[PDB]
Amino acid sequence: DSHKWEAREKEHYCLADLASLMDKTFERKLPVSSLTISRLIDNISSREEIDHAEYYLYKFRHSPNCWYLRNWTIHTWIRQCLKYDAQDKALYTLVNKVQYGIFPDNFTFNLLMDSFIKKENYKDALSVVFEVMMQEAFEVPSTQLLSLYVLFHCLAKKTDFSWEEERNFGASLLLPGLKQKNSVGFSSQLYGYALLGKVELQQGLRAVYHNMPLIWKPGYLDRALQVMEKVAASEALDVLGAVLKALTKLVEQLDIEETEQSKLPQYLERFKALHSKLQALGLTTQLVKEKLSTCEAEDIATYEQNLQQWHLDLVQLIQREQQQREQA
């Protein structure tokens, strides 16, 4: 809803003084203050203003004040994008999140999740969710909704082949770990785990460190072993991949750190037996919805509290700057 953008504290839509101060700070190499960027963000009202604010933020990431990117700037930017468009600029920023630093470490997670789920989006929303959860996610009352969306778009996306696709699937299914019941989910999880372990150990020399930023230990199959133990204490895609793969000097590795290369048929037989056992023992969307029936409260009180606190901080900073400029 648009009611989540009331404490705006507008100033002036004109870019004259703001651009002048920014150019002065960039030429004299002076550290830029977050007040100008916050004013520019609050004064957004068109594509030109959005592009100007994005360029100013990009320069701020290079200006002497690389830090001082207070959370209120990202808050106001995300809120204005959600209330205006949030299609290309917001999508590009969320895909990058390095050249601008739009870290949504607040209720912006739940805000975006609700805006993308209630409106029922598809490809763009899925890509944004993947790109924003690749790093950190799951916190504010929206983890169950995000997991539901991810499971839906994964059951609707059963393909790999490519290297980047497999890497993205693995990075997206790594952090989520609480659906102790799903079948295809854990199947794809174990499949990606095995593929990444093989790529890191029993594969080429280069693809060992740069590709996957994981641990350098030789016990990668131990993760899949622990996963299957946890799921069958009391699958399909991985078995299909194994069946498909059945029919086919500077050394950067320690001698003791041997790679379990000569290992294939025994592991495949064990995995087939374990998959048969699981099928003998033990859609998920209904269970996830039933779980969500309890949560999904949307506590905007924290939103307003943070907004008020940050607005007070910004007003105090502006007053301090005005006093320093006048008394001096």
Partner 1 sequence: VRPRLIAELARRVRALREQLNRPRDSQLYAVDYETLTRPFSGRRLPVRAWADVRRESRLLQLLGRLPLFGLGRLVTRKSWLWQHDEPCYWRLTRVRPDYTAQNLDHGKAWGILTFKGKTESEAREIEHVMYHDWRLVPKHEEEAFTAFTASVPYPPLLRAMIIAERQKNGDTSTEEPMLNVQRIRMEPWDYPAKQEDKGRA
Indicate the residue type of 271.
F
By CB under 8 A, the count of residues binding partner 1 is: 27
Contact 292, 145 (CB under 8 A): yes
Angle at 192 between CA 190 and CA 193, to 5 degrees: 60
Give the number of other Cβ atoms within 10 Å of residue 277's Cβ.
Answer: 11
Of the pair 74, 117, the CB lying nearest partner 1 is at 74
Task: Give the torsion through C-alpha atoms of 188, 190, 196, 200, to 10 deg.
Answer: -170
Taking CB under 8 A as the binding criterion, the range among 14-22, 122-130, 210-218, 312-320 that sits at the site for partner 1 is 210-218
Site for partner 1 in 113-152 (CB under 8 A): 135-136
Give the one residue of 67, 273, 285, 305 binding partner 1; rule: CB under 8 A.
67
Q: How many CA atoms lie within 13 A of 177 on its CB side?
A: 13
Taking CB under 8 A as the rule, does residue 272 contact partner 1? Answer: no
d(C-alpha 36, C-alpha 85), whole Å: 23
For position 214 contacting partner 1 by CB under 8 A, the verdict is yes
The residue from 5, 84, 95, 97 that contacts partner 1 (CB under 8 A) is 97
Listed in sequence order, the residues at least 6 apart from 280 whose beta carbon sits closer than 8 Å to its beta carbon are none
**Cβ distance 227 to 186 under 8 Å?**
yes
Residue from 88, 139, 209, 269 that binds partner 1 (CB under 8 A)? 209
CA distance 220 to 188: 16
Nearer to partner 1, 60 or 271 (CB): 60
Residue 51 within binding range of partner 1, rule CB under 8 A: no
DSSP helix/strand/coil, 166: helix
Among 174, 184, 236, 287, binds partner 1 (CB under 8 A): 174
Among 39-47, 80-88, 95-103, 120-128, which window interacts with partner 1 (CB under 8 A)?
Answer: 95-103
Q: Which of residues 152-171 bind partner 1 (CB under 8 A)?
A: none
Near partner 1 in 224-243, by CB under 8 A:
none
Residues that bind partner 1 (CB under 8 A): 61-67, 97-99, 101, 103, 105, 135-136, 174-175, 206, 209-210, 213-217, 250, 252
